[PDB]
Amino acid sequence: EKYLKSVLRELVTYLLFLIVLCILTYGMMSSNVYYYTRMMSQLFLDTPVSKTEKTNFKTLSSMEDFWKFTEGSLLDGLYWKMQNRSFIFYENLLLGVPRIRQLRVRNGSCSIPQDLRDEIKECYDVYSVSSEDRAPFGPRNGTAWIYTSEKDLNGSSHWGIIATYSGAGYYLDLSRTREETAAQVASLKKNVWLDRGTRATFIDFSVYNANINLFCVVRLLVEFPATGGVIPSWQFQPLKLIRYVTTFDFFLAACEIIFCFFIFYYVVEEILEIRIHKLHYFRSFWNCLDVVIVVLSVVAIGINIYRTSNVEVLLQFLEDQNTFPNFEHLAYWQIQFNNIAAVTVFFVWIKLFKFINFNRTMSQLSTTMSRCAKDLFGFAIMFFIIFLAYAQLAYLVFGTQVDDFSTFQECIFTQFRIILGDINFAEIEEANRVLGPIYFTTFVFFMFFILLNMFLAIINDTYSEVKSDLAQQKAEMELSD
Amino acid sequence: EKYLKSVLRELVTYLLFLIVLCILTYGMMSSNVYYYTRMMSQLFLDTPVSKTEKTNFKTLSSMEDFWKFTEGSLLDGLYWKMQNRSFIFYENLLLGVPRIRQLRVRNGSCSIPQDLRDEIKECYDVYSVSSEDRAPFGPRNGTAWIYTSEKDLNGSSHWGIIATYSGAGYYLDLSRTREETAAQVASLKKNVWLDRGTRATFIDFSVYNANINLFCVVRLLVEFPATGGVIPSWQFQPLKLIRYVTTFDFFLAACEIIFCFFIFYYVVEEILEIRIHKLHYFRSFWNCLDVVIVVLSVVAIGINIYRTSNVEVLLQFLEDQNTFPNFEHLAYWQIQFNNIAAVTVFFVWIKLFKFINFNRTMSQLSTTMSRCAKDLFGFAIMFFIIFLAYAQLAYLVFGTQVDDFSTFQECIFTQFRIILGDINFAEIEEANRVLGPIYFTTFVFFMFFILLNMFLAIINDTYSEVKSDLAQQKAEMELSD
Amino acid sequence: EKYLKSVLRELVTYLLFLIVLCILTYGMMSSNVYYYTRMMSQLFLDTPVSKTEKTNFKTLSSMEDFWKFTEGSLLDGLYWKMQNRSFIFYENLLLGVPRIRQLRVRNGSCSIPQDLRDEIKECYDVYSVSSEDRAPFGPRNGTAWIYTSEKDLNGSSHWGIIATYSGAGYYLDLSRTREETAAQVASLKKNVWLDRGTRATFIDFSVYNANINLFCVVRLLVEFPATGGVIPSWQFQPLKLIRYVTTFDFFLAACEIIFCFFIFYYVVEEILEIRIHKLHYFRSFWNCLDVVIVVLSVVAIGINIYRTSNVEVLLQFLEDQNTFPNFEHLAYWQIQFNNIAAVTVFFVWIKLFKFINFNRTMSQLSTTMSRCAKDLFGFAIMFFIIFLAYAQLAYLVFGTQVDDFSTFQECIFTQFRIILGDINFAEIEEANRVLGPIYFTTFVFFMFFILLNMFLAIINDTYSEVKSDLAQQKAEMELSD
Amino acid sequence: EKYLKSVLRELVTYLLFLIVLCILTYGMMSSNVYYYTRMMSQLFLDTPVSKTEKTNFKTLSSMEDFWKFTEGSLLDGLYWKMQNRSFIFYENLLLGVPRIRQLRVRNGSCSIPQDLRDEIKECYDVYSVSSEDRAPFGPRNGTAWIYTSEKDLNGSSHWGIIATYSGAGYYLDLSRTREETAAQVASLKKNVWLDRGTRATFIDFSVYNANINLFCVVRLLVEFPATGGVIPSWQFQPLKLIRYVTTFDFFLAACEIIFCFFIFYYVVEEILEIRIHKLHYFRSFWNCLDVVIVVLSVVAIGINIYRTSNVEVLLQFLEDQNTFPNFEHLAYWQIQFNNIAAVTVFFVWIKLFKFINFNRTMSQLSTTMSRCAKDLFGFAIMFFIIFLAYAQLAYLVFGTQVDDFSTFQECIFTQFRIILGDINFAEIEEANRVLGPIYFTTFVFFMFFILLNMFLAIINDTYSEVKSDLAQQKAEMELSD
Ligand SMILES: *[C@@H]1O[C@H](CO)[C@@H](O)[C@H](O)[C@H]1NC(C)=O
Ligand SMILES: *[C@@H]1O[C@H](CO)[C@@H](O)[C@H](O)[C@H]1NC(C)=O
Ligand SMILES: *[C@@H]1O[C@H](CO)[C@@H](O)[C@H](O)[C@H]1NC(C)=O
Ligand SMILES: *[C@@H]1O[C@H](CO)[C@@H](O)[C@H](O)[C@H]1NC(C)=O
Ligand SMILES: *[C@@H]1O[C@H](CO)[C@@H](O)[C@H](O)[C@H]1NC(C)=O
Ligand SMILES: *[C@@H]1O[C@H](CO)[C@@H](O)[C@H](O)[C@H]1NC(C)=O
Ligand SMILES: *[C@@H]1O[C@H](CO)[C@@H](O)[C@H](O)[C@H]1NC(C)=O
Ligand SMILES: *[C@@H]1O[C@H](CO)[C@@H](O)[C@H](O)[C@H]1NC(C)=O
Ligand SMILES: [Ca+2]
């Protein structure tokens, strides 16, 4: 009668905590941010490069296509001549200027083998910090032709497709009108700004939508591999820097204050329960889950105080509309805060299973799932050993031919897709006509037919044992009377 | 011997009821209505906008594409010059005129934040009834430039993609020939009829096929979001307003009279069974299903009497062939009647399980499925809590990047597709390269490998218990003799 | 010791029967007939209609596209001017001429409703034999403008997409060169040969490949619905009429004689076993399967004697190379013989399970699968009632919008694909935004989560009962000694 | 206490063996070889053939498209004019010249049937060694018009799509510049080099990337079937011939020496264990797996010594840069070595299950999987008989229409895809509208609903029996005390 009142107290606390958190994650995701990013993407990615071409930005193939993109579709997308400054789609203001930036490697950064020194003169290693070019090159008479260090253009290390590109390099800020920017890009193409030593080219800009009040930090990364070619990549990230403007935003700030108070409450409660039991605490499952929730929530509050709410670059940009707004770090911490927020909300919803042990069937199901975690963990070890064995088989066979097996983690995720049934078997069968079939049939027969059913066998036998033990307990208590 | 005759009586009633209902749902769905809507769709949606373009109506991107559509493909589709008035595909008569209609919002309907009042002048809020513009604008000298209320153009609230658009706005009826309509559309484009304040544009028309006798109420909705862009949408809805023309339609009207008599019979029978048992009635499953069937059938008869069979607008249109036929409400109640009819037919076919308890194995299967509904309901609660937890995780992570996770219900239905195996993992892995993988692998491992098999464990143990209890009952009755 | 010798006798008979049959079905399917049909298909279907168009034959939309096809891509495909008569791909001889044929309906074959008699003048019913036009029309001065009955052009009823088109109609044989055929097709287009009354247009021709010795009977059917539009369809069917040419074909004819002797043997054996047991014969499973095999094999021998080996039209064609070879019936009986042959081979391979009851585990598995057929049949009845209930729900909801739910059998097969995981959920969710989701989630939850696992529960309990009964039998026989 | 030290000894040996092997298979697969092959593929395959065409190399249709490819896209891809010799993508050196090669068949190599000898003059059999043309033809004044035997151009038998093409034929080495090569190809097209007798055309070349130090042996095979048409095929194979250049490659050679020492150790250990037990050795499972690993590793060491490390053709090429480097055999043994390496790594990871029998639950799972292999083998026999029966049904029905059922093994792998849920049901349903549906529904109902669940039933009953036998053993040992 007192434990039920305790569960009532920590339930009427927790449901208010969950309502506050699902209000915050209704205020974060504004209702149609998706259409903003898909209109920006279908403007800059999906449009054809020129009238005489059919390549997108998504399917670039060589470096001349990249010059046609920077001269053509990018300048038709950035500079909408208003029916001054350009409003993209006649709504989205282009903040300041876009910035193009290059990352180079040194000549002779690798090593040509001995018998081929007569033919091939120059080599260029795969991109690294040790291989990076610091020398000025070309006409040397501008910022685009002189190296600039990472701590002098306020950048950060971007994690691209095939490397981790640093924030330094050879930046050139563009201009406010289409004619000045086209003249600067033609001056870069004429003096050869992208040669054999280029390994990455960033195009950074930032737009602002005043209708729904969202920034958008576009980053278009083109990676030139050492193998020759072009790997395009993009990143559209909707910031929200100016909070206080609407009544609902004051409501969200009040819910932020209330959320900080709730996390203070739960941290103090878990410390008071850890002051009693020294280590009779992590031996349960719900106290460890409360540890995970309060650690992720303290990290979320630390990100939202120390990093995201630090709009020095916004007010510093709003003193002159002719520079480049450094919205890189705000977008990076917005991504980190979205990941921490989503994982915190997921474990808060998982925490609800302390409070639906109300019925007898719910107790049977919870006891069943708690008595099979040991044996499912052991079979998860065996299953993942055989699964990573097939993943390394597939990476050694198909790692040079198939997109779905290009890196090792992509081999793992391709095998989860093959288990579910999302196959592109045509490229596997034309990549290797012998082990393609043998890999595929043995992976279907020894996972989806045999090893998949073993998790299910463990769950069957555990559930039958739990139901029979409870029924036999009650039958013994009835035949003892 | 009397209960078997009672089951025989309520079986020879019910099978005639099912034959009447499957005759009605053979007369409703005429055999090839689908090709009529796909030829109308491949005329108006899938055709390229002009000769120099490759955009459809399905893939519009900006507002100039919409003007090229209204000037180009729409007028090549509506006005087939007959080898007067235009027969679409030389079969389908274009009833009257098409109507284009605009929904606007007021200038300054939102609020520009403080530090950006110097740069950005005007804002336009997301569409609502409070934000809607009522002021006349432009040249103000026609119906296209003056607001018209919802109750004065006989419209209704359309439920579009991103809002619930009202029926009011700035309508312009077009004309009978291609030249007059092209002149009116050029007069709209020249005087700027779609500006920054437009939030929706409807294009409504209605065709009639006299060969198979079906109307078709085309509604082409273009939504201009507050973010800038174009979301196209369409709705093709085959009415059938003139019933009595063929012998089979007199047969269908006779089956409608017979169906109303059967529903009178079943309602009186359920009231006579509810007059005996006051509440020893909903404690079963088949009486509650009869309640659901007679409620849905009374609602279907009410829709077919009070709403769908109300062709005042048809006979009112047939006094002058130069106006716009308001076929909005007939199409809306035809959609409602199709949903009620389909759900009524589904629960009538589910009702058949009163009458296939004839064999002993059928009794074993029915007792098995009736003894596991409690435990499958409890595990459905636990499964749906973990499932909605993953859906909110996916909505917070991918809700700004991926089409399949744009809204919350689309996150739920995308997760059902991931469980079945209909994945587009490329866009998930390029949206977020860390939690894309972690979300996907933990959702596969903790649903398709573990929580999916628990429903199956419940069904295994319940079926084994039921078969063993019946076999042990008969063995005890054999060893008692 | 005598039953084992009997099984040895009927095993060394049967394995020779299976080797003969898998030699016949290695001789029937020649090793690369597929590339012959895909080169004919990618010549006539996948090529663009003209240089200024992008439509295939597969994606025709209107009647002017069909005239551009008959004037353009068909005459560039049929008449390869040899580097006389035309060798398609410089290998495949075009036998004789192609024949184009039209099927019409009468004016006023339906009924215009009362209030619309002032506007719409003429109607044309959906195609049937009662609706068919017999009147001569147009200039009336040729075979293309005069009706010809089915028994006077040797045709047969084609089973198209939306009707069952008869063999009669308005045929026009084309000519041997491209210029004469283009002149005849231009004379058809100028005098308007396809008007509002056309319901089907066949294009029949036949090519012969002398390298691998195969005929190919191309039939291109364009169906013009009553709704207006074009439904294209095709049929490529590789005959083989001249048998005796290679040594392997004499070997195949010897295997045909040996197969007729084996079927004589099995029919006499089953009659001798039915003369003993009057009805203690169909009470087993393998005697009924032998009945199915000998009935299908007698039907296969009857088709191969009375119908397929009847090359009167081939030798009758080889007296003049300027007519049309009636290869319709030979292609139809070749399709029927391929279906009978494939089903006979499937049940012959199923018959092999009389002879792998050799081990004790094989006896356990066979007894298990024979003791669960009754209960799986009962649950197959319940499962198919709920499955057809969902299929009729989906046909009433989506039967006017979605290709995958166009007809009722396509609804059934689309639901099997949804169970496996081959979904196009985008068109379902844009067809109906309320019952699309509700139908999809309830079909996943009440099939793939609940009713799918019940077959598995039946198989689990039956296998556990069979293994425990055999183990308990041997334990009782060991504890009785 | 001594067996645990023995397991410790053969575990600290084996984990070092696994670390050495996963270092070798990190050095083999360089981190981004995939982007090198996809840039070569998107240069030579995915580019359009000319400016006025839309065909790739992947979708060739006839022989004039192949001449437009050899004159157009191939010469725009091979000969990048450097901003001498051509650097492809300004990085990849084109080694020497490309070689085009033709395989022909004789006139009259087949047999025209009797009644058609008047019409068709010449036939050409399907390609074989007996059918191959050895006669000189055309102008006869060069290497392109005179037969050259397989042992005089150092080729080997290529295993193409529809045949096994020999290494001989009519080769023509091209030249170093685009003008000379275009002149030679125009001289081949003008004098008709590809006629009716051509059955295959190889285009072989080899590029070298000095940045990441990889060769790439491009082979473009176009197969002209006897049916007329073009089947394109390609093969991109990244060699690595010059080993010693980097510090990591010296580390890899040291790991190769260490791997040869480990395989010497394991072979001597297995021979010492086979000298004790004569045949009490293959009766276990881990000794047979060690046999498989040491046989595959001795074969891998034999391939890497006797075949792959035999760079006579490289140093022989580096004496003159104007010939053709025979990199055929090095690419073939690199493919064989990748397959042997991947399968050896897979069975090494499978060998790890000797050493995770540490816990009691792991012992339960291993005993469970070892007691069900007999019954899963018996049901795998029954399942594969029914599965190959359906595969032969599908090959006889769909083997002339559908790509996914073209050959018999493709029917098997298409059925595994149908079981997982990767269906293209549209082409099956338009190939055969009766047995397409009946085959598909009976294959879903009698595999995914019934026979799939029987493996699972075997695993359920075996796991329940094993857990109950161990629990009953411990309960009997507790009730015996
Ligand atoms: C590149 O480096 C090579 C040697 O490392 C040198 O011979 C060559 O002149 C250099 N070229 C340029 C453009 O720096
Ligand atoms: C120096 O910079 C100017 C831009 O102001 C540019 O036009 C010029 O080309 C540069 N000098 C050389 C030698 O390229
Ligand atoms: C729009 O509103 C702003 C302030 O709300 C005003 O300054 C501006 O003049 C208005 N423009 C138009 C075109 O109404
Ligand atoms: C007034 O309406 C007419 C249409 O009759 C239109 O042509 C004209 O442009 C309108 N007036 C102005 C000032 O736009
Ligand atoms: C078609 O039939 C209608 C009435 O059935 C008639 O008035 C009309 O003249 C006919 N037209 C032709 C072309 O036969
Ligand atoms: C009569 O047939 C000829 C073909 O020989 C055709 O050219 C002509 O057009 C036909 N007559 C009429 C009046 O169309
Ligand atoms: C091909 O062979 C046939 C008979 O086999 C012969 O009549 C014909 O002249 C030959 N043609 C050529 C070009 O060799
Ligand atoms: C002989 O070879 C030359 C190439 O040097 C070629 O141009 C010529 O066409 C050949 N002779 C004949 C008769 O084709
Ligand atoms: Ca699946």
Q: What is the 3-state secondary structure (H, E, C) of B266-317?
A: HHHHHHHHHHHCCCCCCCCCHHHHHHHHHHHHHHHHHHHHHHHCCCHHHHHH
CA atoms within 13 A on the CB side of B52: 4
Distance CA B405, CA B419 (A): 15
* Nearest CA-CA partner of A135 in A145, A121, A123: A145
Q: Is B425 left (phi over 0), alpha (psi -120 to 50) or beta?
A: alpha
Output the six-digit token pair for B324.
């716009």
Task: List B residues 261-320 in contact with A (Cβ-Cβ < 8 A).
Answer: none
Give backbone dihedrals phi and psi of D189, rounded to 5 degrees, phi first: -70, -35
Q: In angstroms, what CA-CA distances link A259 with A264, C183, D456?
A: 9, 83, 48
DSSP run (H or E) holding D104: strand D99-104
Contact B421 A416 (CB under 8 A): no
Reduce the DSSP state of residue A245 to 3 states and report it: coil
CA angle D137, D138, D139 (to 5 degrees): 120
Q: Is A193 exposed, middle or buried (0-12, 13-18, 19+ CB in 10 A)?
A: buried
Contact C35 D225 (CB under 8 A): yes
Residues of B in contact with C114 (CB under 8 A): 242, 245
Residues of D in contact with C412 (CB under 8 A): 441
Which residues neighbour ligand 9 (ion) by CB within 5 Å?
A 421; B 421; C 421; D 421
Q: Is C5 exposed, middle or buried (0-12, 13-18, 19+ CB in 10 A)?
A: exposed
Residue A439 contacts residue D338 (beta carbons within 8 Å): no
Output the six-digit token pair for B335.
């959609």
Q: In angstroms, what CA-CA distances link A377 with B178, D354, D359?
A: 72, 18, 12
Work out which ligand 3 atom sits closest to the CA atom of B112.
Answer: 5
Nearest C-alpha of chain B: how many angstroms from A335? 9
Question: What distance in angstroms lies between residue A248's CA and the mean position of ligand 3's atoms?
Answer: 24
Nearest C-alpha of chain D: how many angstroms from B463? 14
Output the six-digit token pair for C395.
């046909």
Say which experimental method was used.
Answer: cryo-EM
Touching subunits for chain A (3+ Cβ pairs under 8 A): B, C, D
Distance CA B299, CA A250 (A): 45
Distance CA A388, CA A391 (A): 5
Is the minimum distance from the CB of B62 to ligand 4 under 6 angstroms? no
Residues of C in contact with B45 (CB under 8 A): none
Output the six-digit token pair for C139.
């200039």
Reduce the DSSP state of residue C157 to 3 states and report it: coil
Residues of D in contact with B420 (CB under 8 A): 421
Which neighbouring-strand residues pair with C201? C102, C222
Closest ligand by atom to C138 CA: 6
Q: How close are the terminal C-alpha atoms of chain A, in Å?
A: 27
Nearest C-alpha of chain D: how many angstroms from B459? 14
CA angle B224, B230, B233 (to 5 degrees): 95
* Side chain identity, residue A9: R
Q: How close are the terminal C-alpha atoms of chain D, in Å?
A: 27
Helices B373-398 and B408-420 pack at an angle, to 10 degrees, of 110
Q: Is D420 annotated as a binding residue?
A: yes
Question: What distance in angstroms lies between residue D302's CA and the mean position of ligand 8's atoms?
Answer: 48
Nearest C-alpha of chain B: how many angstroms from D421? 7
CB under 6 Å to ligand 1: residues? A 107-108, 121-122
* Side chain identity, residue C297: S
Placement of tokens 């065409």 in the chain: D53
Q: In angstroms, what CA-CA distances link C12 with B354, B455, C7, C9?
A: 52, 48, 9, 5
Nearest CA in chain D to C414: D425
CA angle D174, D178, D181 (to 5 degrees): 30
Q: How many CB pairs under 8 A join B and C?
A: 210
Distance CA B5, CA B7 (A): 5
C62-66 contacts, C-beta under 8 A, 24 or more apart: C62/B89, C62/C229, C62/C230, C63/C194, C63/C224, C63/C230, C65/C230, C66/C194, C66/C201, C66/C222, C66/C230
Distance CA C276, CA C274 (A): 5
Q: Report the residue count for chain D.
A: 481
Option in C400, C422, C454 nearest B459 (CB) = C454
Q: Is B385 exposed, middle or buried (0-12, 13-18, 19+ CB in 10 A)?
A: middle
CA angle B313, B317, B323 (to 5 degrees): 120
CB under 6 Å to ligand 6: residues? C 139, 141-142, 187, 191
* Nearest CA-CA partner of B269 in B3, B2, B14: B14
Task: List A residues 95-124 in contact with C (Cβ-Cβ < 8 A).
Answer: none
Nearest C-alpha of chain A: how many angstroms from B318? 43
How many Cβ atoms sit within 10 Å of the Cβ of residue C341? 23
Contact B413 C429 (CB under 8 A): yes
Distance CA B105, CA B132 (A): 4
Distance CA C32, CA A12 (A): 73
CA atoms within 13 A on the CB side of C325: 27
Placement of tokens 């070798």 in the chain: D24
Output the six-digit token pair for A168.
């330094």
Residue C448 contacts residue B420 (beta carbons within 8 Å): yes
Give backbone dihedrals phi and psi of C199, rounded to 5 degrees, phi first: -120, -15
What torsion, rounded to 10 degrees, do the Cα atoms D294, D299, D303, D306 define?
100
Residue D407 contacts residue D386 (beta carbons within 8 Å): no
Q: How many helices (H) and strands (E) does chain D have?
A: 15, 9
Distance CA C421, CA B420 (A): 5
Q: Is B90 left (phi over 0), alpha (psi -120 to 50) or beta?
A: left
Give backbone dihedrals phi and psi of B262, rounded to 5 degrees, phi first: -65, -40
Residue A122 contacts residue A107 (beta carbons within 8 Å): yes
What torsion, rounded to 10 degrees, do the Cα atoms C385, C390, C396, C399 define?
-110
Q: Is the dihedral of CA D243, D245, D250, D252 positive or negative?
A: negative
Touching subunits for chain B (3+ Cβ pairs under 8 A): A, C, D
Residue C444 contacts residue B448 (beta carbons within 8 Å): no
DSSP run (H or E) holding C384: helix C373-398
Distance CA C116, CA D389 (A): 60
Nearest C-alpha of chain C: how many angstroms from B383? 11
* Nearest CA-CA partner of C129 in C199, C230, C229: C199
Contact B210 C434 (CB under 8 A): no
Q: Is C48 exposed, middle or buried (0-12, 13-18, 19+ CB in 10 A)?
A: middle
- Nearest CA owner, ligand 7 atom 14: D107
Residues of B in contact with A422 (CB under 8 A): 421-423, 425
Contact B400 A349 (CB under 8 A): no
Is the minimum distance from the CB of B122 to ligand 3 under 6 angstroms? yes
Output the six-digit token pair for C109.
């074959």
CB neighbour list of residue C126: distance below 8 Å, 6 or more residues apart? B32, B211, B212, C163, C225, C226
Q: By the CB < 8 Å criterion, does D125 face chain C?
A: yes
Contact D420 B420 (CB under 8 A): no
Question: What distance in angstroms lies between residue C324's CA and the mean position of ligand 7's atoms?
Answer: 28
Distance CA A394, CA A388 (A): 10
Residue A24 contacts residue A259 (beta carbons within 8 Å): yes
Contact A420 C421 (CB under 8 A): yes
Is the minimum distance from the CB of B409 to ligand 4 under 6 angstroms? no
DSSP run (H or E) holding C85: none
Nearest CA in chain D to A462: D464
Q: By the CB < 8 Å criterion, does A456 face chain C?
A: no
Q: Which of C121, C123, C137 to mutate to test the pocket of ligand 5 (most atoms within 8 A of CB)?
A: C121
Determine which of A164, A212, A334, A360 to mutate to test the interface with B (most B C-beta atoms within 10 Å): A212
Contact A318 B116 (CB under 8 A): yes
Nearest C-alpha of chain C: how many angstroms from D369? 17
Nearest CA in chain D to B453: D456
- Where helices occur in B156-283 by DSSP H, the ranges are 178-190, 247-276
Is the minimum distance from the CB of B191 to ligand 4 under 6 angstroms? yes
CB neighbour list of residue C168: distance below 8 Å, 6 or more residues apart? C103, C132, C147, C148, C149, C150, C153, C155
- Nearest CA owner, ligand 4 atom 2: B141
Task: List B residues 402-441 in contact with D (Cβ-Cβ < 8 A).
Answer: 420-421
Output the six-digit token pair for C102.
């039209």
Placement of tokens 């993953």 in the chain: B390
Give backbone dihedrals phi and psi of D105, rounded to 5 degrees, phi first: -125, 160
Is the minimum distance from the CB of B323 to ligand 4 under 6 angstroms? no
Reduce the DSSP state of residue D268 to 3 states and report it: helix
CA atoms within 13 A on the CB side of D460: 29
CA atoms within 13 A on the CB side of C217: 19
Contact C435 B339 (CB under 8 A): yes
Nearest CA in chain C to B363: C378
CB neighbour list of residue D187: distance below 8 Å, 6 or more residues apart? none
Reduce the DSSP state of residue A202 to 3 states and report it: strand
Contact D425 C413 (CB under 8 A): yes
Output the six-digit token pair for A232.
């395009």
What letters, b where the CB count within 10 A reaches 16 and e where it falls short, cover A103-131? bbbebebbebbeebeeebeebbbbbeeeb
Closest ligand by atom to D180 CA: 8
